[PDB]
Design a protein around this ligand. Structure first.
Ligand SMILES: [Mg+2]
Ligand SMILES: [Zn+2]
Ligand SMILES: [Zn+2]
Ligand SMILES: [Zn+2]
Lengths: 196, 133, 141, 43, 84, 65, 114, 559, 159, 263, 158
DNA sequence: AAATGCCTGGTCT
RNA sequence: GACCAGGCA
């Protein structure tokens, strides 16, 4: 995630070549979709880039302190003196093709955090393992190789899909499943089973 | 193997409404005051301007996958400069002793107004637009 | 030497506080169009002046660059995530035996700092890297 | 760690609202989402 | 409480749910090495087969439509129209 | 934790320029900016690599055993 | 843990041949050649050359999924012209130009001082 | 609640999800490992033994393999341990718990599941790496996004069970949802933002690409369509090729504000014989709207054909965009120099109005409207005054934005953004508010200790004049923060309270269904509706039509 | 207020009209007031509309209401849906809440009520007065792990 | 000569700014990529750790070793271990270096790549030599030790390519521009007023003629002439990256030709 | 005049407009009897119920009234002839078409509307989060609970 | 009498 | 069992 409340998981990695590139030959370490910006109004993010760019260039620590007189202009003014378009855009060429990209792109350095919680630490996936002794129902947690909760809410959906059979198969054949003997007179599980 | 409409037009206005490679042209017809024209033209490939003498042609000839060169030494309804292909959609009664039509060249549009075209103008997809000088 | 005082919310009720000292105690005798707009120092009453507004913040939010160019709630989110970030939580992580520890291989101090990170020792034990990012529609992935 | 050591909890009319008087004392932003939002504060 | 083949008011058309259960149940029989009343143009998946046993009205199954009182109406997959 | 061998971004070996960089700062009394350029680090992908590094190892070495 | 070995990007595994040639079914004199453990570098280069031949009516290519390193080149040529030939030629014309560039560069590189 | 109606079931799997543009709408990407765990009891049959035996030989740790072999007696031959695991001659009648393979039907859901759409059947597609991979246009029904959401997968165990998923709960079958009686899956983000550009009249494509785009569409009839242009250069338009995605027989008329079978603004929409004639393609056309190219294509060509429509449109548009590129930066939030001037003063007068009201009010000259305190009326005015101010400075900003401005550029597609976003990012942010009122006097008669007692001026009570661009001032900050909080809080509330309602409704109606006499009764049999929805018509098979006999002058009804 | 109205010439026009909105309710006495059009007087207090105009009207408002909640949010929902609700809320001749005080008392088998807020109790007052559950509720067949009268389990299949 | 033709401007041990003209953009690129990703090289691809009393982790150190650039000119006569008929490795498919460092002084001993010590028999081929461009001659700073810290390693450098791993890239960074003035109109610049006053002007413009005001749009022109520059890590002399690049690409092509044949 | 009804007639028409290539230049072969009597007859084969008795035969009429209105206003003599030059063939097709579609738009016994509805209201409800009345969640809550202490009562008189 | 769903993890009796 | 911390919403 950036430092502006914008988290995201990786969706694929591209090797240097397949990546879009700068005429200078610089290529991005990360690419985020423009669409995660208009609505979140997280402008500072954009700014920070403008700043961090200029900074890295001129080897100056970029001062993004809150209430200061630091302007997006004063910065854009500095970045131009550095031979770059005053906003962060930079013509870029499509890695596959080498051709130019019809749309210049916001390119610069931005401080990004590596959050904990990594797929591999979550990928649980069970196919009938150990069950609770008390309910004869699958156990909780993945550290124990348990089952996923097909709670109330999921059921309603199945009911809504009119998929009667599936439901039975979910709430029975998988998890609780037990055979009991009953008295054909007092429907109680009071019938001594002597199978032999 | 035909031709369906010929006519020189005088361009009165050229409008580039927030497009840099397209302008919507409106040129009147020399000869029959009844005929007027509204067209979308790629001003990047075929400039135009204030009062030009444009020659227009329609037809439906010179639908199988498109091919390109070779015939560069074959057929050639290239007696013009600018040319388009399209599909016509609606024929309308401008009412009175006049009638109009609408063609779409992959989005580039054209409306033609007159009357004797009831015959000379097709009624189907086919429809090339040829312009010269 | 009485140049400062400790005020609690109760006494705060009875005082007038100027934000910036400068910008709030010169006499009004052209303005940069890119700077935000501030009202005026209307008060012949000031008894105190803020050490520095950026101080109204605390640890977490302190590490946000320009959180004053950011939509309110997004600042709160970031503050909750800065605590899930990786980095060197202590130079002696190697000598401490504790349930899970996550350390960054090559921590980088941010190109974008806050005059309040100097005290939060951020630059010394950074949590995050300075990646070259591109906001662009690429493979659609 | 710094943030944990500078934390505040409030058990149990409107208490999770950021409040005027809080200015200067508690961080206006830092606070957990949902559950104990506004109840857990940070100096 | 039964209802003669006449005075039948239920939908002539087969409900999706009915066909999905019919499809399932035949697909299941087919998966259990049961005779196939159709000629496979080269099909192997039980369901895919069973689908084709229906497309050629050759599925010996009948649906019993219980009304809300207790009565019902027996319709045969041969009768029922499969538009959907 | 030690100067990254090579730049994440472009791959320009960089780990063989830390000490050089430091000297350029302390003795040559230069500003981080030029010091960089003199070391041949002209693009920002390769400038943040050194400029931002926080040589933590120097603090891990003070731990006796 | 679900990551595939890097070498699967350029090393054919078992039952994988560099090329597969199936006859397209939609058009005539059309062929879809699938390439294995090859990406854009080749695909696009050959697509571009294949479009210099005036007896070539069509030629496109696609890496259907980044995960995997393989692609498809489609070719349609003038009656009597076998695309496989249209392919052969292209690869050659390509190699030739390449050799050329190799030389001319090596030439210039030698007139250089430093 | 947690053991009888809600149990922990076997054959379930869960991980992080991420979008995959080269996966079909109705599929789902299952990471190899998970597939190697989840299994499916298939009985041995002459129509399969070869494949089955072959898999049993592949064993439990190579994908197309299996685990366990079940026999007549009911014994379980564990394929990973078993002197005889490299032996085993399959016998008709036996069961081979096999790995989950490609094309299996599986129930995929995201929680909370407050829909049918929250649980849908997808065709399996085993792939590398470890995240469920899903088509983007399957995003909204599950209400997912890829910032970290995890999703649950369940595998049918019975031949029937499968059928029940593939015939009733399949993603295709769910495109047109009965709740909103419109479709519930559109085209988003890149594909949407792009499709628009790709459509602009100004947008033309040439040979090399065209040929790729065409090929890119899998169902291509390989027949290169004739260029819109054949003159100096044979160029195709965007519409031209996109139309390849649209199948034949699809028709669609639109007409937005200024449309006119010549739509000078490339407005409305006109699609005939699956060929786009006029109009830029954006949300209204391809969104998940009522009239939509999707609502029409589902109803006309079939769920599946329409299922495909998605990938196609995507594959083409995505590719096109992959090569056109698109982005955004601060620059996109900067307004014309003279504009900020006109804006800053636009506010300058709003403040004077508030001030002029204020003095009026303090003179007791004000006339209190009926039912309101002269005090109430006062407040309401200022609030109105300030809102308008914001909205006009905002509008003022929206006009600068050149068609090339990426933000505006997304707003036009309808791919993210709205007036408000622009207005706040570019011009004045706005009047903060807590409990429907402008910031209160937490302190005695004042907002903060930086103001004098009794001060109802805008700055004092929460009016953030600046923009997110220019930056807020401490006070502004703090204020905007207060509102910020009010938001986050009722956010946490509006969730639980609703979650509860969602249930009471579900329990209350739970057992109500349309019986075989077209009636609608609950378990008891007690009739609730003599005809469902009063027309015994299914919600999905409905659409907003115009009753041409109600309106128009009496003369026109006659003419 | 704005009200479209058929004009003598046929077209619907906009004939604005004065309307009084109130901050307090007492329907029973206001209709009777002269000058007002008692045909249209309305209130968002369906209960009151119930007690005064009958239940069939109450159902109406009950919907008119719910609807407004959902549409004020720009959102739409097909009639039938809300219809069903309101009706289910309106068949027992009175206004039955979606709360436990309403539909769990309903006349239903014990088990359904079991799955909602007053299990324990519901099962006792159910045991005490020997209740016989038909076992035709979906919620109960779920408890017994059997198919239910759902799409797949409404019709029976036979040879 | 024939088509494709170059025009070196700059040149040194590391860079080679040059003009590549009369070629297809498709090629300019294919070339560019290949340079970046398929030219072979020698690099440590296996570290056997004997002792590590250091402050750094084993694999952390191992990672860096892999990244350390090694000589690779004669890599064309060193095999891929996966093709050598040896069990594991040998002197026909690898190069083994030893690293031994002991914290001797109480003044922090640094460990450079210049300390790797080729143990295997190079067999008289220029291969696997800690590349050093330092001024002081201490290629890369691998690690630092304290009072009495030990580090005893044994690495096995193998032939590889940027594709299996980036450590195997010889290229570093490649500049690449074409049509400095947007005559080709392959882009539509983003502006606030004058896209010409806001967007910089590339050095490459100087090497080309302007657009001539009223001239129409050149709708038939394609991309000729490209202004590149190859930076070089150094395991390979810059000239080579360009050649070997051209070579490799050329071989890749040939193998498809050879393919049809065996088909 | 815009109300959700099964069978988008407008479409069927357009889907005849070009399936039979209908030229707006020559006259149709439609008999005024054809159209008028045809449209009428169509209205007999829509059905939603099939009991042969009075009561049910009257329900069936009710449940179709509206749609039919749509149907009649659309398939009117002028219209058919002047608005969209159909032909005995096209027209005749359009009819057979509507029927089928209609029959396809009927609900299927089994459809679990109870839940289907509950959710259709609960969902768009969990999308609500914010001219002085009680709306949103609170109000919806007010309603469902059948509260008597509503905060924003009001009476609207005309 | 009731007060979202689900999911992972960590400490102490 | 007690309990708090976190992810999505
Ligand atoms: Mg989320
Ligand atoms: Zn008994
Ligand atoms: Zn670099
Ligand atoms: Zn060897």
């Amino acid at each position: 995630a950036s430092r502006h409340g914008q988290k995201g998981t990786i969706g694929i990695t591209y090797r240097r070549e397949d990546m879009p590139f700068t005429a200078e030959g610089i290529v991005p370490d990360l690419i985020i979709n423009p669409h995660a910006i208009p609505s979140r109004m997280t402008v500072a993010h954009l700014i920070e880039c403008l700043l961090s760019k200029v900074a890295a260039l001129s080897g100056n620590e970029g001062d993004a302190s809150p209430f200061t007189d630091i302007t997006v202009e004063g910065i854009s003014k500095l970045l131009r003196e550095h031979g770059y378009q005053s906003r962060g855009f930079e013509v870029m060429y499509n890695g596959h093709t080498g051709k130019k990209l019809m749309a210049q792109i916001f390119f610069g350095p931005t401080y990004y955090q590596r959050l904990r919680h990594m797929v591999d630490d979550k990928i649980h996936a069970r196919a009938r393992g150990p069950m609770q002794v008390l309910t004869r129902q699958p156990v909780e947690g993945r550290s124990r190789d348990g089952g996923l909760r097909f709670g109330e809410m999921e059921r309603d959906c199945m009911i809504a899909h009119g998929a009667a059979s599936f439901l039975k198969e979910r709430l029975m054949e998988a998890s609780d499943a037990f055979r009991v003997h009953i008295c054909g007179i007092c429907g109680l599980m009071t019938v001594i089973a002597k199978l032999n | 193997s035909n031709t369906l409409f010929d006519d020189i037009f005088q361009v009165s206005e050229v409008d580039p409404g927030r497009y840099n490679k397209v302008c919507r042209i409106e040129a009147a017809s020399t000869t029959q005051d009844q005929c007027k024209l509204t067209l979308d033209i790629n001003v990047e490939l075929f400039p135009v301007a204030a009062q030009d003498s444009l020659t227009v042609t329609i037809a439906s000839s010179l639908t199988r996958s498109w091919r390109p060169p070779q015939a560069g030494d074959r057929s050639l309804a290239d007696d013009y400069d600018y040319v388009m292909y399209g599909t016509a959609y609606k024929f309308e009664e401008v009412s009175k002793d006049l009638i109009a039509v609408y063609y779409s060249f992959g989005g580039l549009l054209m409306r033609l107004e007159g009357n004797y075209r009831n015959l000379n103008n097709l009624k189907q997809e086919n429809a090339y637009l040829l312009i010269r000088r | 030497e009485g140049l400062v005082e400790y005020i609690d919310a109760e006494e705060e009720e009875s005082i007038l506080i100027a934000m910036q000292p400068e910008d709030l105690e010169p006499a009004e005798a052209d303005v940069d169009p890119a700077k935000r707009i501030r009202v005026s120092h209307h008060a012949t009453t000031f008894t105190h002046c803020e050490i520095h507004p950026s101080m109204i913040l605390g640890v977490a939010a302190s590490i946000i660059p320009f959180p004053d160019h950011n939509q309110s709630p997004r600042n709160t989110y970031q503050s909750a995530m800065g605590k899930q970030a990786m980095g060197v939580f202590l130079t002696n992580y190697n000598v401490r035996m504790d349930t899970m520890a996550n350390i960054l291989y090559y921590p980088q101090k941010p190109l974008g700092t806050t005059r309040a990170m100097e005290y939060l020792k951020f630059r010394e034990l950074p949590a995050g890297q300075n990646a070259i990012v591109a906001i662009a529609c690429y493979s659609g992935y | 760690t710094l943030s944990h050591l500078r934390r505040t909890n409030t058990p149990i009319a409107k208490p999770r609202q950021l409040h005027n008087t809080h200015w200067g004392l508690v961080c206006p932003a830092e606070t957990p989402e949902g559950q104990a939002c506004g109840l857990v504060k940070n100096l | 409480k039964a209802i003669p083949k006449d005075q039948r008011a239920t939908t002539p058309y087969m409900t999706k749910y009915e066909r999905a259960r019919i499809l399932g149940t035949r697909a299941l029989q087919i998966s259990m090495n049961a005779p196939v009343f159709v000629d496979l143009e080269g099909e192997t998946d039980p369901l895919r087969i069973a689908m084709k046993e229906l497309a050629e009205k050759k599925i010996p199954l009948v649906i019993r439509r219980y009304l809300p009182d207790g009565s019902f109406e027996d319709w045969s997959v041969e009768e029922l129209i499969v538009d959907l | 934790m030690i100067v990254p061998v090579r730049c994440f971004s472009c791959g320009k070996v960089v780990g063989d320029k830390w000490e050089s960089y430091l000297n350029l700062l302390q003795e040559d009394e230069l500003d981080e900016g030029t010091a960089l350029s003199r070391l041949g680090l002209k693009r920002y992908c390769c400038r943040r690599m050194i400029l931002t590094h926080v040589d933590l190892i120097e603090k891990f070495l003070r731990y006796n055993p | 843990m679900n990551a595939p070995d890097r070498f699967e990007l350029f090393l054919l595994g078992e039952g994988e041949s560099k090329l597969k040639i199936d006859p397209d079914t939609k058009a005539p004199n059309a062929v879809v050649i699938t390439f294995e453990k090859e990406d854009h570098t080749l695909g696009n280069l050959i697509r571009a050359e294949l479009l210099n031949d005036r007896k070539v009516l069509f030629a496109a290519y696609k890496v259907e999924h980044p995960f995997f390193a393989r692609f498809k080149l489609r070719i349609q040529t003038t009656e009597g012209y076998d695309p496989k030939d249209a392919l052969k030629n292209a690869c050659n014309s390509i190699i030739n130009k390449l050799g050329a560039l190799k030389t001319n560069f090596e030439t210039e590189w030698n007139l250089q001082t430093l | 609640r947690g053991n009888l109606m809600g149990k922990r079931v076997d054959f379930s799997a869960r991980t992080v999800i991420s979008g995959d543009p080269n996966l079909e709408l109705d599929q789902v990407g299952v990471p190899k490992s998970i597939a190697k765990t989840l299994t499916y009891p298939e009985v041995v049959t002459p129509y399969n033994i070869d494949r089955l035996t072959q898999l049993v030989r592949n064993g439990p740790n190579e994908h197309p393999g299996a685990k366990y072999v079940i026999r007549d007696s009911g014994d379980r031959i564990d394929l990973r341990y078993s002197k005889r695991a490299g032996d085993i001659q399959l016998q008709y009648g036996w069961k081979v718990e096999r790995h989950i393979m490609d094309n299996d039907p599986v129930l995929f859901n995201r929680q909370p599941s407050l829909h049918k759409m929250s649980m849908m059947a997808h065709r399996v597609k085993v792939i590398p790496y470890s995240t469920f991979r899903l088509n983007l246009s399957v995003t909204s029904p599950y209400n997912a996004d890829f910032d970290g959401d995890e999703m649950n997968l369940h595998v049918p165990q019975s031949e029937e069970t499968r059928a029940e998923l593939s015939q009733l709960c399949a993603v295709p079958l769910q495109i047109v949802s009965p709740q909103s009686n419109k479709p519930c899956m559109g085209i988003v983000q890149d594909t949407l933002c792009g499709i628009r550009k790709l459509t602009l009249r100004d947008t033309f494509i040439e040979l090399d690409q065209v040929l790729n785009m065409l090929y890119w569409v899998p169902d291509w009839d390989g027949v290169i369509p004739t260029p819109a242009i054949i003159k100096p250069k044979p160029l195709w338009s965007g519409k031209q090729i996109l139309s390849v995605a649209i199948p034949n027989g699809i028709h669609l008329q639109r007409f937005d504000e200024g449309t006119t079978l010549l739509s000078p603004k490339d407005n409305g929409m006109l699609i005939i014989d699956g060929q786009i004639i006029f109009g830029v393609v954006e949300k209204k056309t391809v969104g998940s709207s009522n009239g939509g190219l999707i609502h029409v294509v589902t109803r006309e060509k079939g769920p599946q054909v329409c299922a495909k429509l998605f990938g196609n449109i995507q594959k083409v548009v995505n590719f096109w965009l992959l090569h056109n590129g698109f982005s955004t930066g601060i620059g996109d939030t900067i307004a014309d120099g003279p504009t900020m001037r006109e804006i800053t003063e636009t506010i300058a007068e709003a403040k004077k109005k508030v001030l002029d009201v204020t003095k009026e009010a303090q003179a007791n000259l004000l006339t209190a409207k009926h039912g309101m305190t002269l005090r109430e009326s006062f407040e309401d005015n200022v609030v109105r005054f300030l809102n308008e101010a914001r909205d006009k400075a905002g509008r003022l900003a929206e006009v600068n934005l050149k068609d090339l401005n990426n933000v505006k550029q997304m707003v036009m597609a309808g791919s993210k953004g709205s007036f408000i976003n622009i207005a706040q990012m570019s011009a004045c942010v706005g009047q903060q508010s807590v409990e429907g009122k402008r910031i209160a006097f937490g302190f005695v008669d004042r907002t903060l200790p930086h103001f004098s007692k009794d001060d109802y001026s805008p700055e004092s009570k929460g009016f953030v004049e600046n923009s997110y661009l220019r930056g807020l001032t401490p006070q502004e900050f703090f204020f905007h923060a207060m509102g910020g909080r009010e938001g986050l809080i009722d956010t946490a509330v509006k969730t639980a309270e609703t979650g509860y309602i969602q249930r009471r409704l579900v329990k209350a109606l739970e057992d109500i269904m349309v019986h075989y006499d077209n009636t609608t009764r609950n378990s008891l049999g007690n009739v609730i509706q003599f005809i469902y929805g009063e027309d015994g018509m299914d919600a999905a098979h409905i659409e907003k039509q115009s009753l041409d006999t109600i309106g128009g002058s009496d003369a026109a009804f006659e003419k | 207020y704005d009200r479209k109205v058929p004009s003598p010439t046929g077209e619907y026009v906009k004939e604005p009209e004065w309307v009084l909105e109130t901050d307090g309710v007492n329907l029973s006495e206001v209709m009777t007031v002269p000058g007002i059009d008692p045909t249209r007087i309305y209130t968002n207090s369906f209960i009151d509309i119930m007690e005064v105009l009958g239940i069939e009207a109450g159902r109406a408002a009950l919907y008119k209401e719910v609807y407004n909640v959902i549409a004020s949010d720009g959102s739409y929902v097909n009639y039938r849906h809300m219809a069903l609700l309101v009706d289910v809320m309106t068949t027992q001749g009175g206004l039955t809440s979606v709360t436990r005080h309403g539909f769990n008392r309903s006349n239903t088998g014990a088990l359904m009520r079991c799955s909602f807020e007053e299990t324990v109790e519901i099962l006792f007052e159910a045991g005490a007065s020997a209740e016989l559950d038909d076992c035709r509720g979906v919620s109960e067949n779920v408890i017994l792990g059997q198919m239910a009268p759902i799409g797949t389990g409404a019709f029976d299949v036979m040879i | 000569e024939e088509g494709p033709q170059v025009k070196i401007r700059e040149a040194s041990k590391d860079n080679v700014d040059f003009i590549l003209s009369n070629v297809d953009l498709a090629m300019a690129n294919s070339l560019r990529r290949v340079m970046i990703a398929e030219i072979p090289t020698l690099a440590i691809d296996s570290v056997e750790v004997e002792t590590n009393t250091t402050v750094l982790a084993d694999e952390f150190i191992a990672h860096r070793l892999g990244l350390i650039p090694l000589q690779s000119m004669d890599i064309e006569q060193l095999e891929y271990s996966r093709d050598c008929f040896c069990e594991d490795h040998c002197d026909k498919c690898s190069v083994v270096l030893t690293l031994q460092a002991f914290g001797e002084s109480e003044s922090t001993t640094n460990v450079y790549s210049k300390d790797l010590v080729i143990v295997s028999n190079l067999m008289g081929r220029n291969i696997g030599h800690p590349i050093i461009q330092d001024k002081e001659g201490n290629g890369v700073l691998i690690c630092k030790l304290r009072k009495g810290q030990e580090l005893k390693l044994t690495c096995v450098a193998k032939k590889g390519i940027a594709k299996e791993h980036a450590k195997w890239g010889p290229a570093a960074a490649i500049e690449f521009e074409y049509d400095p003035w947007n005559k080709l109109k392959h882009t539509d610049y983003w502006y606030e007023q004058d896209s010409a006053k806001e967007w910089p002007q590339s050095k490459n413009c100087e090497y080309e003629d302007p657009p001539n005001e009223g001239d129409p749009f050149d709708y038939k022109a394609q991309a000729d002439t490209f202004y590149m520059n190859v930076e070089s890590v150094g395991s390979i002399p810059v000239d080579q990256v360009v050649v070997r690049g051209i070579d490799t690409l050329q071989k890749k092509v040939a193998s498809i030709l050879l393919a049809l044949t065996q088909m | 005049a815009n109300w959700p009804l099964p069978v988008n007639i407008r479409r069927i028409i357009q889907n005849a407009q070009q399936t039979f290539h209908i030229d707006h230049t020559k006259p149709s072969d439609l008999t005024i009897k054809d159209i008028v009597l045809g449209v009428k007859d169509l209205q007999e084969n829509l059905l939603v119920l099939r009991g042969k008795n009075e009561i049910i035969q009257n329900a069936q009429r009710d449940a179709v009234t509206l749609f039919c209105c749509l149907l009649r206003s659309r398939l009117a003599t002028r219209r058919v002839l002047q608005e969209y030059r159909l032909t005995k063939q096209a027209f005749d097709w359009v009819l057979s078409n509507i029927e089928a579609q209609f029959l396809r738009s009927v609900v299927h016994p089994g459809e679990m509307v109870g839940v289907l509805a509950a959710q259709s209201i609960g969902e768009p409800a969990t999308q609500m989060t914010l001219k002085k009345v009680t709306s949103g969640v609170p109000r919806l809550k007010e309603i469902l609970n059948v509260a008597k202490n509503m905060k924003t009562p009001s009476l609207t008189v005309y």
